[PDB]
Amino acid sequence: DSLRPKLSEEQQRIIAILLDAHHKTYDPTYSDFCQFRPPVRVNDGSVTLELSQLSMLPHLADLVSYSIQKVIGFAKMIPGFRDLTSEDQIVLLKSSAIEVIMLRSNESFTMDDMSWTCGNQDYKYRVSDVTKAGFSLELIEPLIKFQVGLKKLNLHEEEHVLLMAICIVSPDRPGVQDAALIEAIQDRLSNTLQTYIRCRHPPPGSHLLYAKMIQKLADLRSLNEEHSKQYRCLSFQPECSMKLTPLVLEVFG
Numbered sequence: 001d002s003l004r005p006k007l008s009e010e011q012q013r014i015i016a017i018l019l020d021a022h023h024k025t026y027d028p029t030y031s032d033f034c035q036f037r038p039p040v041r042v043n044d045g046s047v048t049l050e051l052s053q054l055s056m057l058p059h060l061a062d063l064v065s066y067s068i069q070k071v072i073g074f075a076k077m078i079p080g081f082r083d084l085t086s087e088d089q090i091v092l093l094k095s096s097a098i099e100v101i102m103l104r105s106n107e108s109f110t111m112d113d114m115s116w117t118c119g120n121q122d123y124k125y126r127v128s129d130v131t132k133a134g135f136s137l138e139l140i141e142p143l144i145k146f147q148v149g150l151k152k153l154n155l156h157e158e159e160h161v162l163l164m165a166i167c168i169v170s171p172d173r174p175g176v177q178d179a180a181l182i183e184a185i186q187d188r189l190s191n192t193l194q195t196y197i198r199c200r201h202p203p204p205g206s207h208l209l210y211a212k213m214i215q216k217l218a219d220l221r222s223l224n225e226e227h228s229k230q231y232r233c234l235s236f237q238p239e240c241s242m243k244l245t246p247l248v249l250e251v252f253g
């Protein structure tokens, strides 16, 4: 019964535009990473110790910051995103930033050892490194769970970039002015994704794939909510702002 329409010239161009945007903002080699403040890993195996020193915070905070910059770059390249007001663009970016960081980090995350591998031993990030940055298991364990669930979806790069686009352009963000326009753009992307899936993804990973992708966006809200609680606690630590960046402070604070 179900129709499988072809991708329109506009939909074809949109996937092209997005893929191109991603390749310009995601370094698959991770060759900027050494320019960050060096990672420090102390003896831990204690939340008191974690907050006392916060050895991994300056590095991961630099990574997060770096990523946010790339997300901003990426969002500005989304078809229609430039049509929104500067005020709206900022709101959408700030409230999706952390979600899209988690979302994009999937390219680096490996099921081999349940870590984020960005080359080396220095740039292999485990749960223990994220605790060393002052974040509790209440956020991390379900992040890994989300990361794994997303890996087993086996998304095409075409699907992966369209999802990052849909994440950003969400009309149900707190603070949006022109929610009608944002929804209009999101719809154009959703339909491209729904079309792409139906006529470009082979079974048995094709059936019910869109519904699972929308669900991952709901999990991303939970994590966003959790990150907010944990960043707030983290901020209360004295001389912590210096371990962050002017951009991470503004976007998350």
Ligand SMILES: C=C1C[C@H](C[C@H](C)[C@H]2CC[C@H]3/C(=C/C=C4/C[C@@H](O)C[C@H](O)C4=C)CCC[C@]23C)OC1=O
Pocket (backbone or CB within 6 Å): 057, 060, 061, 063, 064, 067, 101, 102, 104, 105, 106, 107, 108, 109, 116, 118, 125, 130, 133, 135, 227, 231
């Ligand atoms: C300073 C932090 C750390 C924390 C970030 C959280 C816990 C997660 C989300 C994505 C994770 C990671 C992402 C890894 C990368 C590397 C590469 O894939 C680029 C991508 O943008 C990215 C962030 C690995 C460590 C913990 C991160 C930063 O929030 C903060 O404010």
